């Protein structure tokens, strides 16, 4: 394209404008008194929403430069939600704050690199402080309390989570499914989960949540790199004859002919999803075995002279359901052979006993944990299909909030934790003055979420912030009841992981953007 190139402050004002549109649109929804946002749809009537993630998804600007600013913050802030299951809007609010004051200082002649070092330092210390402020959430009593809090004070949801976690471990794999009636059901089943997402976003299925569900799919295990459809057609035909969907777990699927056809062609004729095999090197092969035995299928390895051209249906494994997302694949009910699965777990258990290094032992037991761990399936029952569907959503939300809570504890919600740790860091300094203003920039930015929340309440944000800061510990402002108090006692908290991810990612883009001297885009 002939390009349009901008440098320094020119590129600065451009990015700031794009960020302000994105942040201002999204932040109106912040807090219990958050306002609505109308998103036009050609499909029919507009959508009125308060989900800041939905709003962000719709933000695209006309000016190429401003749009670059917005798309940058959107990409990083989204990583927060992916990591902690929440944090995107807060990440956006913080990012806008750091970027606004950062660029002001830059334009005032301060050194961008120093400013960033200062911002980065304040964030390091602040994360330490949050870690210290964190209230743990380990015992089943705590787990349930967090669960119900997340489920809008639903004692039943908290119970479900706590029960599932107890029956499968706090770091065990738990799924949520539709109930068969009024009563909730919970049953551990043969399954597994690995950190590998879909190869193509175009594999997204009915689940609007950005995931893909496959009922009774055929699992295809091939440690080869499939770039062409030719040597896979026979399998595809057989699968098609079965009418069942397919899950391709290979070393990697290349977008030359395979991923191309699998997506561009299979837009209705079949249901095929593809993901990379877990791990690398030799472990990649071993793990595929675990998955194979688990699903009862066999792996096609060129090493053994296995040919996908001859891969029959009996080679393919199967599971009651499979759910894949951005960065994870969960095999819910492997049709494997109980004894076979137990045999492998034992085989690996033996290998662990005869391990000659910590690294070997560690990875070895991570594998047995997956196989021997199983999947806990929660079946949300209710009186009506509507209630059932609504409760199910609540359970899914509470489950992600609670898991984050068990991992890093919990902290005063309502934007109070950030304003708390910030008030502590008032004496923090750096290698020099620029670095110092960098530190101040971040500390002041940490007050943005609470001030926004109080803004939507029709209250004075600088007065409430001033008050909350003067307090100590988990003392804050409850925007729901609009009264001060102990945030934790008032049941207003966030998993420390989301507040952390939000701050870190926010500081990440803010740092990159503050140290950007040139922007290039098509005319």
Annotated binding site for ATP, which residues? Answer: 29-32, 50, 86-90, 414, 478-480, 494
- Site for its own copies (CB under 8 A): which residue of 16, 19, 23, 72? 72
Minimum CB separation from its own copies for residue 192, in Å?
18
Q: Which residue is nearest to ligand ATP (CB)?
A: 413
Minimum CB separation from Mg ion for residue 87, in Å?
6
Residue 128 touches which of Mg ion, ligand ATP, its own copies, none (Cβ within 5-8 Å per kind): none
Residues 161-190 that bind its own copies (CB under 8 A): 178-182
Largest CA distance in the chain: 73
DSSP assignment of 421-467, as one string? HHHHGGG---SSHHHHHHHHHHHHHTTHHHHHHHHHTTS-HHHHHHH
| Part of the chain binding ligand ATP (CB under 6 A), chosen from 50-58, 180-188, 262-270, 324-332 | 50-58
The answer to whether residues 371 and 338 touch, using CB atoms and an 8 Å cutoff, is: no
Residue 245 touches which of Mg ion, its own copies, ligand ATP, none (Cβ within 5-8 Å per kind): none
Minimum CB separation from ligand ATP for residue 57, in Å?
11
The answer to whether residues 439 and 447 touch, using CB atoms and an 8 Å cutoff, is: no
Phi, psi of 334 (to 5 degrees): -65, 130
Residues 75-104 that bind Mg ion (CB under 5 A): 86
Question: What is the spatial distance between Cα 113 and Cα 128, in angstroms, rounded to a whole number?
Answer: 23
- Site for its own copies (CB under 8 A): which residue of 23, 37, 168, 378? 37
Residue 90 touches which of its own copies, ligand ATP, Mg ion, none (Cβ within 5-8 Å per kind): ligand ATP
Residues 293-322 that bind its own copies (CB under 8 A): none
Minimum CB separation from ligand ATP for residue 34, in Å?
7
The answer to whether residues 217 and 190 touch, using CB atoms and an 8 Å cutoff, is: no
Residue 35 touches which of Mg ion, ligand ATP, its own copies, none (Cβ within 5-8 Å per kind): its own copies
**Burial (CB count <10 Å: 0-12, 13-18, 19+), residue 69:** buried
Q: Which residue is nearest to Mg ion (CB)?
A: 86
Question: In this complex, which beta carbon is closest to its own copies, that of residue 75 or of residue 139?
Answer: 75
**Burial (CB count <10 Å: 0-12, 13-18, 19+), residue 151:** buried
Question: In this complex, which beta carbon is closest to Mg ion, that of residue 86 or of residue 184?
Answer: 86
Question: What is the spatial distance between Cα 164 and Cα 376, in angstroms, rounded to a whole number?
Answer: 6
The answer to whether residues 212 and 324 touch, using CB atoms and an 8 Å cutoff, is: yes
- Site for ligand ATP (CB under 6 A): which residue of 240, 480, 485, 491? 480
Minimum CB separation from ligand ATP for residue 453, in Å?
5
Cα angle 78-82-84, degrees, rounded to a multiple of 5: 110
Assess 521 for contact with its own copies (CB under 8 A): yes
CB burial of 365-402 (b: ≥16 within 10 Å; e: otherwise) equals bebbebbebbbbbbbbbbeeeeebeebbebbbbbbbbb
Question: What is the spatial distance between Cα 121 and Cα 431, in angstroms, rounded to a whole number?
Answer: 10
Residue 114 touches which of Mg ion, its own copies, ligand ATP, none (Cβ within 5-8 Å per kind): its own copies
The answer to whether residues 514 and 11 touch, using CB atoms and an 8 Å cutoff, is: no
Residues 385-444 that bind ligand ATP (CB under 6 A): 413-415
What does DSSP say about strands 246-253 and 272-276: parallel, antiparallel, or unpaired?
parallel
Question: What is the spatial distance between Cα 86 and Cα 273, in angstroms, rounded to a whole number?
Answer: 26
The H or E element containing residue 118 is: helix 112-133
Please provide the size of the chain in residues.
Answer: 523
Our measurement of the distance from residue 192's CA atom to the centroid of its chain's CA atoms, rounded to an integer in Å, reads 19
Question: In this complex, which beta carbon is closest to Mg ion, that of residue 86 or of residue 129?
Answer: 86
Assess 349 for contact with its own copies (CB under 8 A): no
Question: In this complex, which beta carbon is closest to ligand ATP, that of residue 51 or of residue 63?
Answer: 51
- Site for its own copies (CB under 8 A): which residue of 13, 17, 33, 169? 33
Assess 356 for contact with its own copies (CB under 8 A): no
Question: What is the spatial distance between Cα 22 and Cα 18, in angstroms, rounded to a whole number?
Answer: 7
Assess 114 for contact with its own copies (CB under 8 A): yes
Residues in the interface with Mg ion (CB under 5 A) total 1
Tokens of 376: 């806990």
Assess 89 for contact with ligand ATP (CB under 6 A): yes
Minimum CB separation from Mg ion for residue 22, in Å?
16
Residues 238-277 that bind its own copies (CB under 8 A): 243, 254, 256-257, 260, 268-269
Question: In this complex, which beta carbon is closest to Mg ion, that of residue 322 or of residue 502?
Answer: 502
Binding site residues, ligand ATP, CB under 6 A: 30-32, 51-53, 81, 86-90, 149, 413-415, 453, 478-480, 492, 494
Chain positions contacting Mg ion, by CB under 5 A:
86
């Amino acid at each position: 394209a002939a390009k349009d190139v901008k440098f320094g402050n020119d590129a600065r004002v451009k990015m700031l404008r794009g960020v302000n549109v994105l942040a201002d649109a999204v932040k109106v929804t912040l807090g219990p008194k958050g306002r609505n946002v109308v998103l036009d749809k050609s499909f029919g009537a507009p959508t009125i929403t308060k989900d800041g993630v939905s709003v962000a998804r719709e933000i695209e600007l006309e000016d190429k430069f401003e749009n670059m600013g917005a798309q940058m913050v959107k990409e990083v802030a989204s990583k927060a939600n992916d990591a902690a299951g929440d944090g995107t809007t807060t990440a956006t609010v913080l990012a806008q704050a750091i970027i606004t004051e950062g660029l002001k200082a830059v334009a005032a002649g301060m050194n961008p690199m120093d400013l960033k070092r200062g911002i980065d330092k304040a964030v390091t210390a602040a994360v330490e402080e949050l870690k210290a402020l964190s209230v743990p959430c380990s015992d089943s009593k705590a787990i349930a309390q967090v669960g119900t809090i997340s489920a809008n004070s639903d004692e039943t949801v908290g119970k479900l989570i706590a029960e599932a976690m107890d029956k499968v471990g706090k770091e065990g794999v738990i799924t949520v499914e539709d109930g068969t009636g009024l009563q909730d059901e919970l049953d551990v089943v043969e399954g597994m989960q690995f950190d590998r997402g879909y190869l193509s976003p175009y594999f997204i299925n009915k689940p609007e949540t950005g995931a893909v569900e496959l009922e009774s799919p055929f699992i295809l295990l091939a440690d080869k790199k499939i770039s062409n459809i030719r040597e896979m057609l026979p399998v595809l035909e057989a699968v098609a004859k079965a009418g069942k969907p397919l899950l391709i777990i290979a070393e990697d699927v290349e977008g030359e002919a395979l991923a191309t056809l699998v997506v561009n062609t299979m837009r209705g004729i079949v249901k095929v999803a593809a993901v990379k095999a877990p791990g690398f090197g030799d472990r990649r092969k071993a793990m595929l075995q675990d998955i194979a035995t688990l699903t009862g299928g066999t792996v096609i390895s060129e090493e053994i002279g296995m040919e996908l051209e001859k891969a029959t249906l009996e080679d393919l494994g199967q599971a009651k359901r499979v759910v894949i997302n951005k960065d994870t694949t969960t095999i819910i009910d492997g049709v494997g052979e109980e004894a076979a699965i137990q045999g492998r777990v034992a085989q690996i258990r033996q290998q662990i006993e005869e391990a000659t290094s910590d690294y070997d032992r560690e990875k070895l037991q991570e594998r047995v944990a997956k196989l021997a761990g199983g999947v806990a399936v929660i079946k949300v029952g209710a009186a009506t299909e509507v209630e059932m569907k609504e409760k199910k959503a609540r359970v899914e939300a509470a489950l992600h909030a609670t898991r984050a809570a068990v991992e890093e504890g919990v902290v005063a919600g309502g934007g109070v934790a950030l304003i708390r740790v910030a008030s502590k860091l008032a004496d923090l300094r750096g290698q020099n003055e620029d670095q110092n203003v960098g530190i101040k920039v971040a500390l002041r930015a940490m007050e943005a979420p609470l001030r926004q929340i109080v803004l939507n309440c029709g209250e004075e944000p600088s007065v409430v912030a001033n008050t909350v800061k003067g307090g100590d510990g988990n003392y804050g402002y409850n925007a729901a009841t609009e009264e001060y108090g102990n945030m934790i006692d008032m049941g207003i908290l966030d998993p420390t992981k989301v507040t952390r991810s939000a701050l870190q990612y926010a500081a990440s883009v803010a740092g990159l953007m503050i140290t950007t001297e040139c922007m290039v885009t098509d005319l």
